[PDB]
Scaffold this motif. Structure first.
Motif, PDB file in Angstrom:
ATOM      1  N   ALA A  14       0.836  -1.191   0.000  1.00  0.00           N
ATOM      2  CA  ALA A  14       0.000   0.000   0.000  1.00  0.00           C
ATOM      3  C   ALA A  14       0.880   1.253   0.000  1.00  0.00           C
ATOM      4  CB  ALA A  14      -0.974  -0.015   1.159  1.00  0.00           C
ATOM      5  N   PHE A  18       1.385   4.782  -2.917  1.00  0.00           N
ATOM      6  CA  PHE A  18       1.557   6.230  -2.708  1.00  0.00           C
ATOM      7  C   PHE A  18       2.922   6.718  -3.210  1.00  0.00           C
ATOM      8  CE2 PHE A  18      -1.600   5.097   0.464  1.00  0.00           C
ATOM      9  CZ  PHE A  18      -2.493   6.144   0.410  1.00  0.00           C
ATOM     10  N   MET A  70       1.157   4.006  11.660  1.00  0.00           N
ATOM     11  CA  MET A  70      -0.197   4.508  11.444  1.00  0.00           C
ATOM     12  C   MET A  70      -1.206   3.404  11.050  1.00  0.00           C
ATOM     13  SD  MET A  70      -2.170   5.177   8.579  1.00  0.00           S
ATOM     14  CE  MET A  70      -1.031   5.578   7.262  1.00  0.00           C
ATOM     15  N   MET A  71      -0.778   2.459  10.210  1.00  0.00           N
ATOM     16  CA  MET A  71      -1.646   1.373   9.750  1.00  0.00           C
ATOM     17  C   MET A  71      -1.810   0.253  10.760  1.00  0.00           C
ATOM     18  SD  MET A  71      -2.790   2.244   6.797  1.00  0.00           S
ATOM     19  CE  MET A  71      -3.437   0.705   6.117  1.00  0.00           C
ATOM     20  N   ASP A  77     -11.435   3.452  12.700  1.00  0.00           N
ATOM     21  CA  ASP A  77     -11.426   4.568  11.761  1.00  0.00           C
ATOM     22  C   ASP A  77     -12.811   5.234  11.710  1.00  0.00           C
ATOM     23  OD1 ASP A  77     -10.493   6.349   9.857  1.00  0.00           O
ATOM     24  OD2 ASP A  77      -9.978   4.809   8.356  1.00  0.00           O
ATOM     25  N   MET A 123     -10.554  -9.992  -9.840  1.00  0.00           N
ATOM     26  CA  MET A 123     -10.956  -8.966  -8.848  1.00  0.00           C
ATOM     27  C   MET A 123     -12.477  -8.892  -8.757  1.00  0.00           C
ATOM     28  SD  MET A 123      -8.449  -5.674  -8.877  1.00  0.00           S
ATOM     29  CE  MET A 123      -9.123  -5.028  -7.346  1.00  0.00           C
ATOM     30  N   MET A 144     -13.244  -3.552   0.989  1.00  0.00           N
ATOM     31  CA  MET A 144     -12.575  -2.423   1.620  1.00  0.00           C
ATOM     32  C   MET A 144     -12.283  -2.617   3.104  1.00  0.00           C
ATOM     33  SD  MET A 144     -11.977  -0.269  -0.691  1.00  0.00           S
ATOM     34  CE  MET A 144     -11.549  -1.841  -1.442  1.00  0.00           C
TER      35      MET A 144
ATOM     36  N   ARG B   2      -4.966  -9.831  -3.150  1.00  0.00           N
ATOM     37  CA  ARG B   2      -3.835  -8.893  -3.253  1.00  0.00           C
ATOM     38  C   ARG B   2      -4.209  -7.463  -3.647  1.00  0.00           C
ATOM     39  NH1 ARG B   2       1.181  -9.330  -4.413  1.00  0.00           N
ATOM     40  NH2 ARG B   2       0.934  -8.323  -6.463  1.00  0.00           N
ATOM     41  N   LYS B   3      -4.872  -7.332  -4.797  1.00  0.00           N
ATOM     42  CA  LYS B   3      -5.198  -6.010  -5.340  1.00  0.00           C
ATOM     43  C   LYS B   3      -6.322  -5.292  -4.595  1.00  0.00           C
ATOM     44  CE  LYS B   3      -2.027  -6.488  -8.406  1.00  0.00           C
ATOM     45  NZ  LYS B   3      -0.744  -5.739  -8.363  1.00  0.00           N
ATOM     46  N   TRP B   4      -7.332  -6.054  -4.177  1.00  0.00           N
ATOM     47  CA  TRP B   4      -8.399  -5.452  -3.362  1.00  0.00           C
ATOM     48  C   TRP B   4      -7.837  -4.976  -2.020  1.00  0.00           C
ATOM     49  CZ3 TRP B   4     -12.474  -3.318  -5.118  1.00  0.00           C
ATOM     50  CH2 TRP B   4     -13.256  -3.893  -6.110  1.00  0.00           C
ATOM     51  N   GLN B   5      -6.925  -5.751  -1.419  1.00  0.00           N
ATOM     52  CA  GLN B   5      -6.394  -5.356  -0.109  1.00  0.00           C
ATOM     53  C   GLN B   5      -5.511  -4.105  -0.226  1.00  0.00           C
ATOM     54  OE1 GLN B   5      -7.734  -6.524   2.504  1.00  0.00           O
ATOM     55  NE2 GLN B   5      -6.481  -5.627   4.165  1.00  0.00           N
ATOM     56  N   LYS B   6      -4.786  -3.992  -1.340  1.00  0.00           N
ATOM     57  CA  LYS B   6      -3.933  -2.827  -1.576  1.00  0.00           C
ATOM     58  C   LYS B   6      -4.816  -1.577  -1.691  1.00  0.00           C
ATOM     59  CE  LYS B   6      -0.106  -1.795  -4.855  1.00  0.00           C
ATOM     60  NZ  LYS B   6       0.567  -2.558  -5.945  1.00  0.00           N
ATOM     61  N   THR B   7      -5.924  -1.725  -2.386  1.00  0.00           N
ATOM     62  CA  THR B   7      -6.846  -0.628  -2.628  1.00  0.00           C
ATOM     63  C   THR B   7      -7.520  -0.274  -1.316  1.00  0.00           C
ATOM     64  OG1 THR B   7      -7.204  -1.428  -4.897  1.00  0.00           O
ATOM     65  CG2 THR B   7      -8.840   0.104  -4.000  1.00  0.00           C
ATOM     66  N   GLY B   8      -7.927  -1.298  -0.567  1.00  0.00           N
ATOM     67  CA  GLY B   8      -8.521  -1.080   0.703  1.00  0.00           C
ATOM     68  C   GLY B   8      -7.575  -0.370   1.644  1.00  0.00           C
ATOM     69  N   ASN B   9      -6.325  -0.801   1.638  1.00  0.00           N
ATOM     70  CA  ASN B   9      -5.341  -0.208   2.520  1.00  0.00           C
ATOM     71  C   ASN B   9      -5.049   1.217   2.145  1.00  0.00           C
ATOM     72  OD1 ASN B   9      -4.844  -2.076   4.583  1.00  0.00           O
ATOM     73  ND2 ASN B   9      -3.560  -3.327   3.231  1.00  0.00           N
ATOM     74  N   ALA B  10      -5.137   1.542   0.854  1.00  0.00           N
ATOM     75  CA  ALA B  10      -4.905   2.904   0.443  1.00  0.00           C
ATOM     76  C   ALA B  10      -6.035   3.791   0.962  1.00  0.00           C
ATOM     77  CB  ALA B  10      -4.770   3.004  -1.065  1.00  0.00           C
ATOM     78  N   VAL B  11      -7.261   3.298   0.894  1.00  0.00           N
ATOM     79  CA  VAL B  11      -8.415   4.067   1.359  1.00  0.00           C
ATOM     80  C   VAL B  11      -8.334   4.223   2.881  1.00  0.00           C
ATOM     81  CG1 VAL B  11     -10.921   3.978   1.698  1.00  0.00           C
ATOM     82  CG2 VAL B  11      -9.932   3.522  -0.580  1.00  0.00           C
ATOM     83  N   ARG B  12      -7.928   3.147   3.559  1.00  0.00           N
ATOM     84  CA  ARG B  12      -7.799   3.147   5.005  1.00  0.00           C
ATOM     85  C   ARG B  12      -6.692   4.108   5.470  1.00  0.00           C
ATOM     86  NH1 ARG B  12      -7.735  -1.811   5.227  1.00  0.00           N
ATOM     87  NH2 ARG B  12      -9.785  -2.204   6.181  1.00  0.00           N
ATOM     88  N   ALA B  13      -5.581   4.150   4.738  1.00  0.00           N
ATOM     89  CA  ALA B  13      -4.502   5.066   5.060  1.00  0.00           C
ATOM     90  C   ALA B  13      -4.985   6.522   4.973  1.00  0.00           C
ATOM     91  CB  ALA B  13      -3.334   4.851   4.123  1.00  0.00           C
ATOM     92  N   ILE B  14      -5.667   6.836   3.891  1.00  0.00           N
ATOM     93  CA  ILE B  14      -6.207   8.176   3.710  1.00  0.00           C
ATOM     94  C   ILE B  14      -7.180   8.525   4.843  1.00  0.00           C
ATOM     95  CG2 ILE B  14      -7.686   9.620   2.232  1.00  0.00           C
ATOM     96  CD1 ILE B  14      -6.433   7.908  -0.149  1.00  0.00           C
TER      97      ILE B  14
END
Ligand code: CA
Ligand code: CA
Ligand code: CA
Ligand code: CA
Lengths: 147, 20
Positions: A14, A18, A70-71, A77, A123, A144, B2-14
């Motif tokens: 993740a 960024f 942070m994570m 949240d 996906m 999510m 893999r890809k869903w978790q990366k996307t989820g983690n990006a949203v969670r980080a924000i």
């Protein structure tokens, strides 16, 4: 729940999303780019305010240790739902309540993920737990909110 | 995932950077 090597690896993936120039730090510019790919248009001040809340070494950017801290945190949240709802709207560009294969591919590409057709289809399959060939909002929420 | 978790983690980080 404890920190695991698998979670650390996931957080590094993740972080890389960024850190698009791969220099090991997330800048305001990088954070704003990702936020725009996900349906927001943060002000200059909020980007620096966001980074400030986790910038332990005060260099003004986020490195992986700071991102990891942070994570990994036990938080809950309080802003989660809003973020996930906005993200859904970016995916569901035609607003019909379902994310299609094309819609998914589009957003993933803007996130820097040039998925193959097989990955796109996988996906959709993973998320499409009701089996109607598309991803609705409740299905999206499950993807999510997985930890 | 893999890809869903990366996307989820990006949203969670924000979301977490925004909350904290
Ligand atoms: Ca960088
Ligand atoms: Ca820093
Ligand atoms: Ca749609
Ligand atoms: Ca479905």
């Amino acid at each position: 729940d404890q920190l695991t090597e698998e979670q650390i690896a996931e957080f590094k993936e993740a972080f890389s999303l960024f850190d698009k120039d791969g220099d090991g730090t997330i800048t305001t510019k990088e954070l704003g780019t990702v936020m725009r790919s996900l349906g927001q248009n943060p002000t200059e001040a909020e980007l620096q305010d966001m980074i400030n809340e986790v910038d332990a070494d005060g260099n003004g950017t986020i490195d992986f240790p700071e991102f990891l801290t942070m994570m990994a945190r036990k938080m809950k949240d309080t802003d989660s739902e809003e973020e996930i709802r906005e993200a859904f709207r970016v995916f569901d560009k035609d607003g019909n309540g379902y994310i299609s294969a094309a819609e998914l591919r589009h957003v993933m590409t803007n996130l820097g993920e040039k998925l193959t057709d097989e990955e796109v289809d996988e996906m959709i399959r993973e998320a499409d737990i009701d089996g109607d060939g598309q991803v609705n909002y409740e299905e999206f929420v499950q993807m999510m909110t997985a930890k | 995932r893999r890809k869903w978790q990366k996307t989820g983690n990006a949203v969670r980080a924000i979301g977490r950077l925004s909350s904290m």
